[PDB]
Design a protein around this ligand. Structure first.
Ligand SMILES: [Mg+2]
Ligand SMILES: [Mg+2]
Ligand SMILES: [Mg+2]
Ligand SMILES: [Mg+2]
Ligand SMILES: [Mg+2]
Ligand SMILES: [Mg+2]
Ligand SMILES: [Mg+2]
Ligand SMILES: [Mg+2]
Ligand SMILES: [Mg+2]
Lengths: 32, 93, 117, 87, 96, 273, 43, 64
RNA sequence: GGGAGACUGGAAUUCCUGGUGUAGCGGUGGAAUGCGCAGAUAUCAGGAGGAACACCGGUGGCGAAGGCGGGUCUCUGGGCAGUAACUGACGCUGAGGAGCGAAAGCGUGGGGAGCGAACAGGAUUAGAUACCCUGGUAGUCCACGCCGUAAACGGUGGGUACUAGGUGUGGGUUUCCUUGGGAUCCGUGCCGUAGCUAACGCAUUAAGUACCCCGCCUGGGGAGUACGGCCGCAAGG
């Protein structure tokens, strides 16, 4: 089909990965 | 197998083409040279496709089926009409 | 100085400039020229007129030494190869023979990326 | 895989009767010999990744044949098992 | 045993009168280990296509050996280690 | 390589050599000589080489580094033993003459195989061969520095020298360090790479193993007084107060052999990176 | 019968030549007639 | 080209990596291997000729 | 070009050495950062090293899917035809589970030619942290191991009997000529009626006529997210 849903999923995954990269250090400090 | 010779094919004059704007960009599989702004056609590939079409027509007539012609220009109407009246096959002029 | 009856010539004509260099059959160059040396600079080096000028300058520098016949070795693509050959043959030198000595990598070193412009 | 003599002798040794090719016991013996050959080949080349799949397929076929012979006659199944040294 | 064809390119500096004794001494190992029929064809003094170890021509030779893979491999190793030899090519004649 | 378990803090990530390829557990009583530790003290008794002290006493296990004689006499390897003074295991030869000797036991040297020295020997790992007869491009180790002088290059474990194209009366060698040297072709060489390649990956785990091997602690100059090390102590954690310099005042410079030495054989030094 | 202004992706059994030349077209038609006659004679 | 083959049809000839004349009659002027569409041979014999030309180039029987 | 292990060679780029050799070379729609006058660029001879193997090389071949073509040697899996001999239902699928599994990334010891994440600058733009240019660390390579992610697309699961066919291609066999055609079974192509559909399109290699089995769904975001659990050194699934 079109690429609207694909672009939405890409944006969501990119924001999730950015949040993960930001909170990586905190998650590691909590899981150490 | 071969039925027609390149000598006769060239003497008949079956290698001329169109002008620059009336050319097909996708025809890179058959163009050989361009002399005096006239696209020259290959010979070996044509001779092979001739035998391919001969085998195709042989299989078609073996399975059952004739060839039907069509024409609209005013330069070969009588020619195709005579050919059809001689061979007993369809034709339109 | 020295004297050389006949020799070879190498024409490296890239998409930016043409470098013509005449040498002896051994491989020792004695007279070279280019558009950058004849006066053109930058994009003006990748032109057929600049290539012809460099070729005629090289031919004159070779005649100054005593070269009369050369065997031409052109390089990979680039506008100015036939022009340089004509300039060499018109400046007072014999073409003799022409060979396209172009390095054809058989899928060797990976080339750079593609231009997106 | 297997020559015409090393296989013919195995067939004649593990066959039901003369000129018996394809019986359950003979097929199981041939599959076991091929399994040993492929195991040695893999021990030599421990990174094939295709001989391993072939070995798995042959082992599946051998397991199917063993199940069939066990469902048909348990006596013959146990006899073949004790004669070949499996399980 | 299996059949194999060995094409050897030796050094052109040597004379044609020391090619057969050298090949015989190199094949004695196979003759004593496996045993087989031999077929030596010496047609040296042939111009090569390109340069090989700073040489223009070479001495070509063809040998046919119906022997074992280990035997032919040892022969190829000895030929490669030898200094008079320049190149060796082993091909299979049965099927490949 | 055998990795110990994390039972105690001293075996967190500790490892040891698998000791594979070793058959015998004792050396040859006839080829064993005495040697006592020195603690890094020269004849004057003063501590010369620091970080050298108490360590487990070892035996010499005499090894022939020349191999000039016994050319046409073959020899079959008997056992592969451990050597403390070396970095790789040693191999015991049983010469057809009747005597026994020791070798560095290069890689791929199994038990039972036979080697043969001399000029007419075959190119195989284990046997010695003159560089004149060794084809160019092979791999050798522990060859020599001078004719009949004894092996002095590429004797450590897992190291090997690459014999490049030789010319005239000299042959080119690429050392494990990358240096390109030239040595007269009359030098006897051992073919093959040194064994015990798994070495250099053993995690000692604790200081006990290094202390048993004979390595005392090492005190950095930053925590020393200005009278003991140029890197004065100061008030707090000091970075040295000046450029890095040896304890005796020698800066971290070239420190190479004296200028214009007998180094005409070297053609290209190693690369720093 | 294709020319320099035909589509190879459309034509499946390309028969190159020329259609503007009346003599060439007549000769091609004669050749096709002979071919179909030789095909029919087999029945 | 346009012919069946000289091996798949003549059934009286073999392909060897030593037939310098046979390999030169097939490779191009610049020493390049000609295409199947130009040689007019079966796939098996075409691959055989390619392997023979490669073996010749390796044993230094052709100028690549 | 089915995979694994070993040996070996050519083109080409880079660097160094020995000759010839000048004041430019690289670069762009134009321009310089970069390389030079300490001898740049360029040509001949020699040496060092690593990725890949032009031409054969394609709507072509293999593999369960990824994926796979310089040459040689050892082993091995899969498939097709003919004889049609052998046991005679042993056939197909498969919840969990196990194995393989594109690229990217991490540890160990190496190597690193070219390309090239990040990083530096040169240039346009009002702003370029990008598209363009110049150097380049990880990465791309080798052996031991790891996560199991791709538009892993034929977006179409495996198996079975049938549905005008037309026509190129690879393979094994037969009747008719006596090199040419028909028949035989599988894959690979492209059209096409019957049939299917919302149309595109499939149409004997179904998306058609019938059946066994596994997985998925009952509106888009929230969210393939948080929680707990599992695998994993870590990213991560
Ligand atoms: Mg110390
Ligand atoms: Mg202090
Ligand atoms: Mg002081
Ligand atoms: Mg402070
Ligand atoms: Mg499952
Ligand atoms: Mg990778
Ligand atoms: Mg890594
Ligand atoms: Mg860049
Ligand atoms: Mg999640």
């Amino acid at each position: 089909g079109s690429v609207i849903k694909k672009r939405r999923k890409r944006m969501s995954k990119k924001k999730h990965r950015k949040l993960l990269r930001r909170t990586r250090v905190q998650r590691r400090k909590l899981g150490k | 197998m071969a039925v027609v010779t390149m000598k006769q094919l060239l003497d008949s004059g079956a290698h001329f083409g169109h002008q620059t704007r009336r050319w097909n960009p996708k025809m890179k599989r058959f163009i050989f040279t361009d002399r005096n702004g006239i696209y020259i056609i290959d010979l070996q590939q044509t001779l092979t496709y001739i035998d391919k079409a001969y085998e195709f027509v042989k299989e078609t007539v073996a399975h059952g089926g004739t060839v039907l012609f069509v024409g609209t220009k005013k330069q070969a109407q009588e020619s195709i009409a005579e050919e059809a009246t001689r061979v007993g096959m369809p034709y339109v002029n | 100085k020295k004297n050389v009856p006949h020799g070879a010539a190498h024409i490296k004509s890239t998409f930016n400039n043409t470098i013509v260099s005449i040498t002896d059959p051994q491989g020792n160059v004695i007279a070279w020229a280019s558009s950058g040396h004849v006066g053109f600079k930058g994009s003006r080096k990748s032109t057929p007129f600049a290539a012809q000028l460099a070729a005629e300058n090289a031919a004159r520098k070779a005649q100054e030494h005593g070269v009369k016949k050369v065997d031409v070795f052109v390089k990979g693509p680039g506008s100015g190869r036939e022009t340089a050959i004509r300039s060499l043959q018109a400046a007072g030198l014999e073409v003799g023979t022409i060979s396209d000595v172009t390095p054809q990598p058989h899928n060797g070193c990976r080339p750079p990326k593609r231009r997106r412009v | 895989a297997l020559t015409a003599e090393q296989k013919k002798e195995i067939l004649g040794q593990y066959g039901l009767h003369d000129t018996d090719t394809g019986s359950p016991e003979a097929q199981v013996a041939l599959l076991t010999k091929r399994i040993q050959d492929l195991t040695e080949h893999l021990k030599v080349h421990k990174h094939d990744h295709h001989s391993r799949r072939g070995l798995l397929l042959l082992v599946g076929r051998r397991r199917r044949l063993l199940k069939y012979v066990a469902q048909v006659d348990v006596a013959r199944y146990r006899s073949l098992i004790e004669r070949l040294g499996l399980r | 045993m299996r059949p194999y064809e060995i094409m050897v390119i030796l050094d052109p500096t040597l004379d044609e009168r020391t090619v057969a004794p050298s090949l015989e001494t190199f094949l004695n190992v196979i003759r004593k280990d496996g045993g087989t029929v031999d077929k030596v064809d010496i047609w040296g003094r042939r111009r090569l296509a390109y340069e090989i170890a700073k040489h223009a021509e070479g001495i070509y030779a063809v040998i046919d050996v119906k022997a074992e893979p280990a035997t032919v491999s040892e022969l190829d190793r000895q030929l490669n280690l030898n200094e008079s030899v320049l190149r060796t090519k082993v091909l299979r004649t049965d099927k490949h | 390589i055998r990795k110990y378990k994390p039972t105690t803090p001293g075996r967190r990530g500790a490892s040891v050599s698998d000791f594979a390829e070793i058959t015998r557990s004792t050396p040859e009583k006839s080829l064993v000589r005495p040697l006592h530790g020195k603690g890094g003290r020269n004849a004057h008794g003063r501590i010369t080489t620091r970080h050298k002290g108490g360590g487990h006493k070892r035996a010499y296990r005499v090894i022939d580094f020349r191999r000039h004689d016994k050319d046409g006499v073959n020899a079959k390897v008997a056992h592969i033993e451990y050597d403390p003074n070396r970095t790789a295991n040693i191999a015991l030869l049983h010469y057809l003459d009747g005597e026994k000797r020791y070798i560095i036991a290069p890689q791929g040297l199994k038990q039972g195989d036979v080697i043969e020295s001399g000029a007419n020997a075959d190119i195989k790992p284990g046997n010695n061969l003159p560089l004149r007869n060794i084809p160019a491009g092979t791999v050798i180790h522990a060859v020599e520095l001078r004719p009949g002088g004894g092996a002095k290059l590429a004797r450590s474990a897992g190291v090997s020298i690459q014999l490049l194209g030789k010319e005239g009366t000299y042959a080119a060698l690429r050392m494990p360090s990358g240096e390109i040297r030239r040595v007269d072709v009359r030098c006897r060489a051992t073919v093959g790479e040194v064994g015990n390649a798994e070495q250099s990956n053993i995690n000692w785990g604790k200081a006990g193993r290094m202390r048993w091997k004979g390595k005392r602690p090492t005190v950095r100059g930053v925590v020393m007084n200005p009278v003991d090390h140029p890197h004065g102590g100061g008030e707090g954690k000091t970075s040295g107060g000046r450029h890095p310099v040896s304890p005796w005042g020698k800066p971290e410079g070239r420190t190479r052999k004296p200028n214009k030495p007998s180094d005409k054989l070297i053609v290209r030094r190693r690369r720093t990176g | 019968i294709l020319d320099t202004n035909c589509d190879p992706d459309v034509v499946d059994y390309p028969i190159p030549g020329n259609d503007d030349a009346i003599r060439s077209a007549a000769l091609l038609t004669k050749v096709i007639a002979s071919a179909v006659a030789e095909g029919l004679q087999a029945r | 080209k346009t012919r069946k083959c000289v091996f798949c049809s003549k059934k009286g000839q073999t392909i060897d990596y030593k037939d310098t004349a046979l390999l030169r009659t097939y490779i191009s002027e610049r020493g390049k291997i000609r295409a199947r569409r130009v040689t007019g041979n079966c796939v098996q014999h075409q691959r055989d000729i390619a392997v023979a030309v490669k073996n010749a180039r390796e044993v230094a029987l052709l100028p690549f």
